[PDB]
Amino acid sequence: KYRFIDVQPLTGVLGAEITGVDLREPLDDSTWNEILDAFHTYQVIYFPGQAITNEQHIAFSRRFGPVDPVPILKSIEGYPEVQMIRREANESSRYIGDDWHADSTFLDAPPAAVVMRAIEVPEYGGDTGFLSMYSAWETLSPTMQATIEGLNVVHSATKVFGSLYQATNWRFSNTSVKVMDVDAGDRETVHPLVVTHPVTGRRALYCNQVYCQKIQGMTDAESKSLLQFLYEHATQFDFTCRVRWKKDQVLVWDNLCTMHRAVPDYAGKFRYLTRTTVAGDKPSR
Amino acid sequence: NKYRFIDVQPLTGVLGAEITGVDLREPLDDSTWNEILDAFHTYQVIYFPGQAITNEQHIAFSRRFGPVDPVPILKSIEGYPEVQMIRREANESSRYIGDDWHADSTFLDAPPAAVVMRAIEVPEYGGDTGFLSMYSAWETLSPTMQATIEGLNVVHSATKVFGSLYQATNWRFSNTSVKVMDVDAGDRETVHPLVVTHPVTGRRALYCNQVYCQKIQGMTDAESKSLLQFLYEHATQFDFTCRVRWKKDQVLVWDNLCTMHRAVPDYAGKFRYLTRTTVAGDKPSR
Amino acid sequence: KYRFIDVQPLTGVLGAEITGVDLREPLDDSTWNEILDAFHTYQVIYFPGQAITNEQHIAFSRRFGPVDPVPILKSIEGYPEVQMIRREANESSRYIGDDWHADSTFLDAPPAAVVMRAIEVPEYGGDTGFLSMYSAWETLSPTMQATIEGLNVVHSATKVFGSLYQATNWRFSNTSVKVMDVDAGDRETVHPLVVTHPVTGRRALYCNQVYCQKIQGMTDAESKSLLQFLYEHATQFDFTCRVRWKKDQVLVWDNLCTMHRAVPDYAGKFRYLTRTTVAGDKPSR
Amino acid sequence: KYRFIDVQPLTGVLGAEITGVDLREPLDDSTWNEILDAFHTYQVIYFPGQAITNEQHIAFSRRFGPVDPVPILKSIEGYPEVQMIRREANESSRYIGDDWHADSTFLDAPPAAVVMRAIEVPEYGGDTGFLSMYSAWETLSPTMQATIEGLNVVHSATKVFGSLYQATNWRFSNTSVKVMDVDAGDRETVHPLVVTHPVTGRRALYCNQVYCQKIQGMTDAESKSLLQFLYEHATQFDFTCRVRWKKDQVLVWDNLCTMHRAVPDYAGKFRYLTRTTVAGDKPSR
Ligand SMILES: O=C(O)COc1ccc(Cl)cc1Cl
Ligand SMILES: O=C(O)COc1ccc(Cl)cc1Cl
Ligand SMILES: O=C(O)CCC(=O)C(=O)O
Ligand SMILES: O=C(O)CCC(=O)C(=O)O
Ligand SMILES: O=C(O)CCC(=O)C(=O)O
Ligand SMILES: O=C(O)CCC(=O)C(=O)O
Ligand SMILES: [Co+2]
Ligand SMILES: [Co+2]
C-alpha cells in the first residue's frame, strides 16, 4: 500500500516500524503524508536507526504540531524544546512512567503526540509498553458505551507533583524532573470519559491511574468501583505492544488514544532518551 | 402518630412498622383497611403479633391485597393447596431457605407485589428475618449514577434455585418445603428493569438480587459482574436494613418490590415453621 | 441454667436481655458472677428499665474493670468517668460510630468492655449494631485460619483525628467530641489479627475499617486485598444483631470480640446516651 | 559469559535469543550444557532460523526430557510425538491459549517444558506472551510468602474440555483440538501453590485461572478472593515479555516457572506451529 515509505506493523492492534526514509533529510509532501497516515492508522510508529541532530529532531515534531513542552521535564542544553528521559546507572528512585497512562492530562489541553529519540539505551531492558484506547473503548458492549458515553472525569497532577506527592516517601530524581509548584500541580481539570480523535474521528476511552481522580458528580465510592473496572479492562495484554529500544531509534506516539509505560527492568544500567512534545486541543466528546 | 383505627409503631427510621389494635379473625371494616394499607406502602414491611387466626382467615387476609398465587418451588399443606410452607426440622443439614438477600421469584414475568407470613411454630430466640428498602438503596446513589443506570434492564432467571447451576451443586434444598420443580422452568429467562417505580406510590426504587439476577441485558459477563457487584455492596449496607423477630402467631406482610428479605440461619437443631400465601402482582415497569 | 437472673437471648449468634436484677443496689456475688458469665457468653447484654444514677453506673462498670475514659469524647458535668454520646436535633455534621469498629483499637491496650446507658432516645430509630468476631473467625476454613493466624495489623487513629482526618470534609460537632492531638492521631500501634479472649480463651478476629491501616510487613497492595476480604466476611448480616434503645436501658459489650456501629436512621431527632469504659490489657494472640 | 552459543537476552526479567549453533546437527556436550543452562536462567529461549525436521525436532526435546504428547492436541501424520497449533483463515471459534496459563496442569505431573517451531506464521500478528512466575513469587512480601507458602491448589481440565465446557456458549475448532473424554476432564488434582523448581531450586508461584478451581481447604469465598489477588499480581506487565514469531524459529519455554498465552490479533490470517512436550515430575514444594 504505502508508496514512499516501507511500513512494517508490529501487532494486529497498534504499532509499526517505518523504514526506507531518512529523517536527516527534509521530507517531501507525499512522503510525509504517508508518515502521517501511518501514525493515524498505527498509533505508535518508530523509525530505527536515525542519527538526527536535536535540530532535525525539533523540526520533525513540528510537522505534527507546535512544540508544547511538558511541565516536569528538564530541557537539554540550548534546546528548551528538547526534554530528557534520562536515568543514571545509580537507580533506587521512582521510575518515570512506571504505570500505564497518557502524558500530562492534568492540563486543560494536553499533548496530542510526543516523539522520542533513543540516545543511549542498554543492550536489553528498559522497553516501553503501549496500548490502544481505540481498542479499549471498541471492545466494550454498546450498552456499556451508552451507559458511560456521557460521563466526564476530573484529572489532576497531585500524585506526580501535588499534595499527595508532597506527603509521600520518595521522589523522582532531579535529572529529568523540575521542582514544581504544589498548587499548580494539584490543579483539577475536566475531560470526557470518551474522547473523539480530532483527525480519525474514531472514539477512544480516556482515563488513567496516574491523574484521573474521580468521575465528575459521583461519590468516591462509585467512582473507584467504575474507574477500577476500566483500568482492569483497558490494560489487558491483548491490547498492548512492546517497543524495544536501540540507539538512534525514533518513535512517535499518539497521546490521546494510546497509553504507554516504562518497564523498570534495567537497574544498574544507563538509559537516556530525548523527547519533544507536540500540542493538542481540549479533548472533545 | 396520625392514625384512627390502628396503632402503628415503626421499627427503624428507614423501613418497618408494628401494627396493633385489630383482630384478623374479624373481617376489617373499611375505615380500618384503608389506614392499614397507607402504612404498608410507607413502611414497606408491617407485622401483627399474636393473631391466632386460621388458614381460612389466613387466605382471606392475603386475598384483600390481591389474589392468592403460590410460588413454584414451595409446597402447600394437607387440605390447603393455597397455604405454603416454611418448614424446617430440628435436625436439618439441608440448605436454609432464602439465606441471601432477595425478592421472591423475580424470574416470573410479573413477579409478586407482596407476601404474608404467619408464625406457626417459631423458636423463642433464633430465626429472625431481615429486610431492607431498595428505595433507600437507590435514593442514596448520586444523581449522576442514577442518571447513568436508570435505563438498564436485567435478565433474571431461576437457573440457580432449580436450573443447571442448582442441579450441579452440593447440598440441595430442604425437601420439606421444596417441590420437584424442574430444570426448564428454572433456566427460564425473563427481563425487568434495573430501576422500578411502585404502582401505588410513584417512588423510584432499585431491582436486583444475587439469587436471580444473572446479567445486565447487553453487557459482557465481566462488565455486568462489576456493576451488579457494586450495587449489592451498596444496597445491602446495614443502615438500609432492619430485622424482624418472630413470636408464634406473629402475622406479617412484606412488599416484594421495594424491599428485599432473607432468612437468618441461627438455630440449627431447632424447629421453625411459618406459613405464607403470596398475593400476585403486575409486570414491573420503569 | 441461670438462677439469679433472667436471660432472654436476642439471636443465636450473640446478644441478650438480662432482667430480674436491680442495678441500683449492690449485687450479691452469685448474681454478679452470672451477670459476667452471661456477658462472657453472649458478648452484648442489656438491662431494660434500670433507672440508675451516675454513681451506681460507675460502680457497676468498676465490677468489669477499672474505669478509664476514652480520648475524644466529652465527660459529663461533675463526673469525669462518664462520657457523652450526645447528638442534637440539628444534623449538620457526621455521625459517631458511623461504620463497624471496636473502640480505640489504636490504643496500645484498648478498652475491654464499655457500658452505655440510654438517657433519652427516639421512639423509633437510633439503633446500635453489634456483631461477633468469634463468629467471624469460627466460620473461616481451618485452612484459612492457619494462613492468617500469625499476622499482625497496624492500627492508627488517623481518619478520626490524625493528618488524614484534618484534610477532607465535615468535622464532628463538639456537642460530645473533644479536640484531639494529631501526633497521637497518626500514632501507630500493632496488635494481632487474631486475638484470644483473656477470660474465655476463645479466639476472635480483630480488624476494623476505622483504625486498621495495614497488615504488618505487607505490601500496600497485599494488605489492601486482604483486609478488604475480612471486612467483607466479618460484616455479613448473619453475624450481627440490633439493639433498640429505650430510656434507662443499660448495656455492656465486649470491646474485644464484638464490633459495633451506630445507625443514622434518626436524622432530625435527639438521642443522648452516656457511657463508661472498662480497660483491658494489650490484646494477645 | 556464554562461549559455545550466542545468548542475547530479551528483557531484564525473562527471555533470550540463541544464535551461533545449528540445531540440525547434534549437540556436543559443551554446547548443550550452555543451552540448558540458558533455558534455566532465562526461562524462555528461542532460536531464529532453524529449518529442522520433525525428527531433528523430536531429537532435540528428548535432550530436555521424554516427550509425552499433551492431551487435546492433534498430532501430525507420521509423527505422533509432534502436535499441531494450526488455525485456518476461517477462524472465529475460541482461540487456543487465549488467557495466561501453564500447559495442562490438571495432570498429576504436568510437562516440564515444551519446544515450538514456527512453520508458517503471519507477517505481523499472533505473538505469544510469557511471564515469570519466579518474579510473581519474588515480588511478594516475605510476610506474604510465609502466609501462602503452605497452601495447595486444585487444578482441573474442567473449563477446557470438562463439565462446564460441555454446557457453555461457544466451542473450539478441531483443526488442533481433539474430542476429549468428559470425566477425564473433570478429574481433579492437587499441587502446591509455591513450587521449588527441580534444577534451579528457585521457588515459583504456581496457579492459573484456566485450570485452578480452588485452594484446598478453603471456602469458595476464600479461595475465590485469594487467587483473584494472585492472578492480578502475577500478571503485571513488568513480569511479561513478548515473542514475535517468524518462520523456522524454535522456542523452548519452562512449563513450571512460566505462564504463556496466545494473542488473538491475527483474525483472517493463517498460523501454524508445531510443538513437542517434555515430561516432568509431580510438582513439589
Ligand atoms: O511526564 C508525564 O507526562 C507524566 O509521567 C508520569 C506518568 C506516571 C507516573 Cl507514576 C509518573 C510520571 Cl512522571
Ligand atoms: O472510642 C474511640 O476512639 C472509638 O470510637 C469511635 C470510632 C469510630 C467512630 Cl466513626 C466514632 C467513634 Cl466515638
Ligand atoms: O521511559 C519511558 O519509556 C518514557 C517515559 C514516559 O512514559 C513519558 O515520557 O511519559
Ligand atoms: O425467613 C425465612 O426463613 C423464610 C423467608 C424466605 O426465604 C422465603 O419465604 O422465600
Ligand atoms: O452511638 C452509638 O450507639 C454507639 C457508637 C459507638 O460506636 C461508640 O460510642 O463507641
Ligand atoms: O500459539 C500459541 O501461542 C500457543 C498456544 C498455547 O497456549 C499452548 O501451547 O498451550
Ligand atoms: Co424469601
Ligand atoms: Co499453552
PDB file of N, CA, C and O in Angstrom, chain C residues 139-144 146-148 151 215-219 221-222 225-226 229 233, chain D residues 139-148 151 215-219 221-222 225-226 229:
ATOM      1  N   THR C 139     -16.122 -19.239  61.412  1.00  0.00           N
ATOM      2  CA  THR C 139     -16.606 -19.563  60.070  1.00  0.00           C
ATOM      3  C   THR C 139     -15.523 -19.534  59.006  1.00  0.00           C
ATOM      4  O   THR C 139     -15.830 -19.714  57.826  1.00  0.00           O
ATOM      5  N   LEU C 140     -14.286 -19.270  59.367  1.00  0.00           N
ATOM      6  CA  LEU C 140     -13.234 -19.420  58.399  1.00  0.00           C
ATOM      7  C   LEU C 140     -12.818 -20.879  58.325  1.00  0.00           C
ATOM      8  O   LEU C 140     -12.808 -21.595  59.333  1.00  0.00           O
ATOM      9  N   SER C 141     -12.429 -21.312  57.126  1.00  0.00           N
ATOM     10  CA  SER C 141     -11.971 -22.691  56.974  1.00  0.00           C
ATOM     11  C   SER C 141     -10.767 -22.905  57.886  1.00  0.00           C
ATOM     12  O   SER C 141      -9.942 -21.998  58.046  1.00  0.00           O
ATOM     13  N   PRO C 142     -10.638 -24.064  58.514  1.00  0.00           N
ATOM     14  CA  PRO C 142      -9.422 -24.329  59.294  1.00  0.00           C
ATOM     15  C   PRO C 142      -8.192 -23.905  58.520  1.00  0.00           C
ATOM     16  O   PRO C 142      -7.314 -23.210  59.050  1.00  0.00           O
ATOM     17  N   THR C 143      -8.165 -24.288  57.242  1.00  0.00           N
ATOM     18  CA  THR C 143      -7.080 -23.899  56.345  1.00  0.00           C
ATOM     19  C   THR C 143      -6.864 -22.394  56.344  1.00  0.00           C
ATOM     20  O   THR C 143      -5.747 -21.921  56.561  1.00  0.00           O
ATOM     21  N   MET C 144      -7.938 -21.624  56.215  1.00  0.00           N
ATOM     22  CA  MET C 144      -7.784 -20.171  56.158  1.00  0.00           C
ATOM     23  C   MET C 144      -7.154 -19.638  57.431  1.00  0.00           C
ATOM     24  O   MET C 144      -6.224 -18.829  57.394  1.00  0.00           O
ATOM     25  N   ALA C 146      -5.152 -20.812  59.687  1.00  0.00           N
ATOM     26  CA  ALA C 146      -3.726 -21.050  59.868  1.00  0.00           C
ATOM     27  C   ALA C 146      -2.884 -20.140  58.982  1.00  0.00           C
ATOM     28  O   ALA C 146      -1.720 -19.853  59.309  1.00  0.00           O
ATOM     29  N   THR C 147      -3.458 -19.698  57.861  1.00  0.00           N
ATOM     30  CA  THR C 147      -2.797 -18.766  56.967  1.00  0.00           C
ATOM     31  C   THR C 147      -2.614 -17.409  57.624  1.00  0.00           C
ATOM     32  O   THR C 147      -1.505 -16.868  57.653  1.00  0.00           O
ATOM     33  N   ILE C 148      -3.683 -16.881  58.225  1.00  0.00           N
ATOM     34  CA  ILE C 148      -3.653 -15.561  58.855  1.00  0.00           C
ATOM     35  C   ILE C 148      -3.360 -15.571  60.352  1.00  0.00           C
ATOM     36  O   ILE C 148      -2.987 -14.519  60.899  1.00  0.00           O
ATOM     37  N   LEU C 151      -0.628 -13.317  61.725  1.00  0.00           N
ATOM     38  CA  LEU C 151      -0.401 -11.983  61.217  1.00  0.00           C
ATOM     39  C   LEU C 151      -0.664 -10.947  62.288  1.00  0.00           C
ATOM     40  O   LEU C 151      -1.338 -11.214  63.275  1.00  0.00           O
ATOM     41  N   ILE C 215      -1.655  -4.585  57.267  1.00  0.00           N
ATOM     42  CA  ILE C 215      -1.010  -5.775  57.790  1.00  0.00           C
ATOM     43  C   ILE C 215       0.464  -5.508  57.987  1.00  0.00           C
ATOM     44  O   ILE C 215       1.118  -4.937  57.110  1.00  0.00           O
ATOM     45  N   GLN C 216       1.002  -5.938  59.128  1.00  0.00           N
ATOM     46  CA  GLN C 216       2.432  -5.774  59.396  1.00  0.00           C
ATOM     47  C   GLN C 216       3.286  -6.397  58.291  1.00  0.00           C
ATOM     48  O   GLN C 216       3.175  -7.588  57.978  1.00  0.00           O
ATOM     49  N   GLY C 217       4.111  -5.569  57.661  1.00  0.00           N
ATOM     50  CA  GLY C 217       5.107  -6.140  56.804  1.00  0.00           C
ATOM     51  C   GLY C 217       4.613  -6.620  55.476  1.00  0.00           C
ATOM     52  O   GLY C 217       5.213  -7.529  54.902  1.00  0.00           O
ATOM     53  N   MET C 218       3.496  -6.108  55.010  1.00  0.00           N
ATOM     54  CA  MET C 218       2.952  -6.498  53.724  1.00  0.00           C
ATOM     55  C   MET C 218       2.984  -5.293  52.808  1.00  0.00           C
ATOM     56  O   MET C 218       3.119  -4.147  53.231  1.00  0.00           O
ATOM     57  N   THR C 219       2.903  -5.575  51.538  1.00  0.00           N
ATOM     58  CA  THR C 219       2.793  -4.513  50.569  1.00  0.00           C
ATOM     59  C   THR C 219       1.428  -3.867  50.724  1.00  0.00           C
ATOM     60  O   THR C 219       0.474  -4.527  51.134  1.00  0.00           O
ATOM     61  N   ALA C 221      -0.515  -3.217  48.535  1.00  0.00           N
ATOM     62  CA  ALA C 221      -1.417  -3.976  47.676  1.00  0.00           C
ATOM     63  C   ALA C 221      -1.901  -5.261  48.336  1.00  0.00           C
ATOM     64  O   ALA C 221      -3.096  -5.574  48.294  1.00  0.00           O
ATOM     65  N   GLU C 222      -0.980  -6.035  48.921  1.00  0.00           N
ATOM     66  CA  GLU C 222      -1.366  -7.253  49.633  1.00  0.00           C
ATOM     67  C   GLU C 222      -2.308  -6.912  50.783  1.00  0.00           C
ATOM     68  O   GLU C 222      -3.423  -7.436  50.875  1.00  0.00           O
ATOM     69  N   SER C 225      -5.833  -5.962  49.670  1.00  0.00           N
ATOM     70  CA  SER C 225      -6.658  -7.061  49.187  1.00  0.00           C
ATOM     71  C   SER C 225      -7.219  -7.852  50.361  1.00  0.00           C
ATOM     72  O   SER C 225      -8.350  -8.345  50.295  1.00  0.00           O
ATOM     73  N   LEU C 226      -6.411  -8.023  51.422  1.00  0.00           N
ATOM     74  CA  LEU C 226      -6.687  -8.987  52.480  1.00  0.00           C
ATOM     75  C   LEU C 226      -7.672  -8.429  53.486  1.00  0.00           C
ATOM     76  O   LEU C 226      -8.656  -9.080  53.847  1.00  0.00           O
ATOM     77  N   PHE C 229     -11.175  -8.415  52.278  1.00  0.00           N
ATOM     78  CA  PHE C 229     -11.905  -9.675  52.363  1.00  0.00           C
ATOM     79  C   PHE C 229     -12.461  -9.893  53.737  1.00  0.00           C
ATOM     80  O   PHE C 229     -13.624 -10.285  53.891  1.00  0.00           O
ATOM     81  N   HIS C 233     -16.111 -10.347  54.979  1.00  0.00           N
ATOM     82  CA  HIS C 233     -16.543 -11.625  55.520  1.00  0.00           C
ATOM     83  C   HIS C 233     -17.100 -11.450  56.912  1.00  0.00           C
ATOM     84  O   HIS C 233     -18.073 -12.120  57.292  1.00  0.00           O
TER      85      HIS C 233
ATOM     86  N   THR D 139       8.350 -10.991  44.035  1.00  0.00           N
ATOM     87  CA  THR D 139       7.835  -9.680  44.401  1.00  0.00           C
ATOM     88  C   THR D 139       6.802  -9.696  45.521  1.00  0.00           C
ATOM     89  O   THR D 139       6.242  -8.642  45.810  1.00  0.00           O
ATOM     90  N   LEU D 140       6.479 -10.840  46.123  1.00  0.00           N
ATOM     91  CA  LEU D 140       5.613 -10.855  47.297  1.00  0.00           C
ATOM     92  C   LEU D 140       6.415 -10.519  48.543  1.00  0.00           C
ATOM     93  O   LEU D 140       7.607 -10.791  48.631  1.00  0.00           O
ATOM     94  N   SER D 141       5.768  -9.918  49.511  1.00  0.00           N
ATOM     95  CA  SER D 141       6.496  -9.626  50.737  1.00  0.00           C
ATOM     96  C   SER D 141       6.893 -10.927  51.432  1.00  0.00           C
ATOM     97  O   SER D 141       6.135 -11.903  51.411  1.00  0.00           O
ATOM     98  N   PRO D 142       8.050 -10.969  52.065  1.00  0.00           N
ATOM     99  CA  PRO D 142       8.387 -12.124  52.901  1.00  0.00           C
ATOM    100  C   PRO D 142       7.217 -12.548  53.794  1.00  0.00           C
ATOM    101  O   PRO D 142       6.934 -13.744  53.932  1.00  0.00           O
ATOM    102  N   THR D 143       6.569 -11.576  54.455  1.00  0.00           N
ATOM    103  CA  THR D 143       5.404 -11.871  55.282  1.00  0.00           C
ATOM    104  C   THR D 143       4.338 -12.579  54.487  1.00  0.00           C
ATOM    105  O   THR D 143       3.797 -13.609  54.903  1.00  0.00           O
ATOM    106  N   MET D 144       4.049 -12.040  53.320  1.00  0.00           N
ATOM    107  CA  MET D 144       3.020 -12.595  52.475  1.00  0.00           C
ATOM    108  C   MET D 144       3.381 -14.006  52.054  1.00  0.00           C
ATOM    109  O   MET D 144       2.523 -14.900  52.026  1.00  0.00           O
ATOM    110  N   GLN D 145       4.650 -14.214  51.706  1.00  0.00           N
ATOM    111  CA  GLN D 145       5.131 -15.526  51.306  1.00  0.00           C
ATOM    112  C   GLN D 145       4.845 -16.566  52.362  1.00  0.00           C
ATOM    113  O   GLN D 145       4.275 -17.615  52.070  1.00  0.00           O
ATOM    114  N   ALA D 146       5.179 -16.261  53.617  1.00  0.00           N
ATOM    115  CA  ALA D 146       5.062 -17.260  54.681  1.00  0.00           C
ATOM    116  C   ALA D 146       3.616 -17.626  54.924  1.00  0.00           C
ATOM    117  O   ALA D 146       3.310 -18.711  55.435  1.00  0.00           O
ATOM    118  N   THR D 147       2.736 -16.690  54.613  1.00  0.00           N
ATOM    119  CA  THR D 147       1.302 -16.882  54.729  1.00  0.00           C
ATOM    120  C   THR D 147       0.746 -17.872  53.695  1.00  0.00           C
ATOM    121  O   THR D 147      -0.004 -18.797  54.046  1.00  0.00           O
ATOM    122  N   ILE D 148       1.108 -17.711  52.417  1.00  0.00           N
ATOM    123  CA  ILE D 148       0.530 -18.537  51.350  1.00  0.00           C
ATOM    124  C   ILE D 148       1.415 -19.727  50.981  1.00  0.00           C
ATOM    125  O   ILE D 148       0.988 -20.586  50.193  1.00  0.00           O
ATOM    126  N   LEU D 151       0.012 -23.552  51.121  1.00  0.00           N
ATOM    127  CA  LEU D 151      -1.268 -23.925  50.542  1.00  0.00           C
ATOM    128  C   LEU D 151      -1.051 -24.821  49.329  1.00  0.00           C
ATOM    129  O   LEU D 151       0.009 -24.796  48.680  1.00  0.00           O
ATOM    130  N   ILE D 215      -8.249 -23.240  46.159  1.00  0.00           N
ATOM    131  CA  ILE D 215      -7.295 -23.677  47.166  1.00  0.00           C
ATOM    132  C   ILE D 215      -7.884 -24.794  48.011  1.00  0.00           C
ATOM    133  O   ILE D 215      -8.972 -24.660  48.584  1.00  0.00           O
ATOM    134  N   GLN D 216      -7.125 -25.875  48.154  1.00  0.00           N
ATOM    135  CA  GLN D 216      -7.519 -26.960  49.034  1.00  0.00           C
ATOM    136  C   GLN D 216      -7.712 -26.421  50.434  1.00  0.00           C
ATOM    137  O   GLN D 216      -6.786 -25.859  51.034  1.00  0.00           O
ATOM    138  N   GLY D 217      -8.884 -26.678  50.983  1.00  0.00           N
ATOM    139  CA  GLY D 217      -9.171 -26.308  52.333  1.00  0.00           C
ATOM    140  C   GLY D 217      -9.794 -24.952  52.514  1.00  0.00           C
ATOM    141  O   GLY D 217      -9.879 -24.486  53.648  1.00  0.00           O
ATOM    142  N   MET D 218     -10.282 -24.314  51.462  1.00  0.00           N
ATOM    143  CA  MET D 218     -10.902 -23.021  51.645  1.00  0.00           C
ATOM    144  C   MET D 218     -12.294 -23.050  51.053  1.00  0.00           C
ATOM    145  O   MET D 218     -12.579 -23.765  50.074  1.00  0.00           O
ATOM    146  N   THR D 219     -13.134 -22.211  51.640  1.00  0.00           N
ATOM    147  CA  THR D 219     -14.476 -21.975  51.143  1.00  0.00           C
ATOM    148  C   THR D 219     -14.436 -21.198  49.827  1.00  0.00           C
ATOM    149  O   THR D 219     -13.597 -20.318  49.619  1.00  0.00           O
ATOM    150  N   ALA D 221     -15.698 -18.738  48.878  1.00  0.00           N
ATOM    151  CA  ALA D 221     -15.469 -17.308  49.060  1.00  0.00           C
ATOM    152  C   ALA D 221     -13.993 -17.019  49.286  1.00  0.00           C
ATOM    153  O   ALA D 221     -13.390 -16.206  48.576  1.00  0.00           O
ATOM    154  N   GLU D 222     -13.376 -17.747  50.216  1.00  0.00           N
ATOM    155  CA  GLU D 222     -11.963 -17.545  50.483  1.00  0.00           C
ATOM    156  C   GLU D 222     -11.162 -17.821  49.222  1.00  0.00           C
ATOM    157  O   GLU D 222     -10.553 -16.914  48.639  1.00  0.00           O
ATOM    158  N   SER D 225     -11.379 -15.123  46.431  1.00  0.00           N
ATOM    159  CA  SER D 225     -10.629 -13.885  46.639  1.00  0.00           C
ATOM    160  C   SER D 225      -9.124 -14.075  46.448  1.00  0.00           C
ATOM    161  O   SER D 225      -8.468 -13.255  45.798  1.00  0.00           O
ATOM    162  N   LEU D 226      -8.556 -15.149  46.993  1.00  0.00           N
ATOM    163  CA  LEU D 226      -7.109 -15.195  47.117  1.00  0.00           C
ATOM    164  C   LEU D 226      -6.453 -15.338  45.775  1.00  0.00           C
ATOM    165  O   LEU D 226      -5.437 -14.686  45.511  1.00  0.00           O
ATOM    166  N   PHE D 229      -6.484 -12.252  43.743  1.00  0.00           N
ATOM    167  CA  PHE D 229      -5.368 -11.384  44.053  1.00  0.00           C
ATOM    168  C   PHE D 229      -4.108 -11.859  43.393  1.00  0.00           C
ATOM    169  O   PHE D 229      -3.290 -11.037  42.964  1.00  0.00           O
TER     170      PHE D 229
END
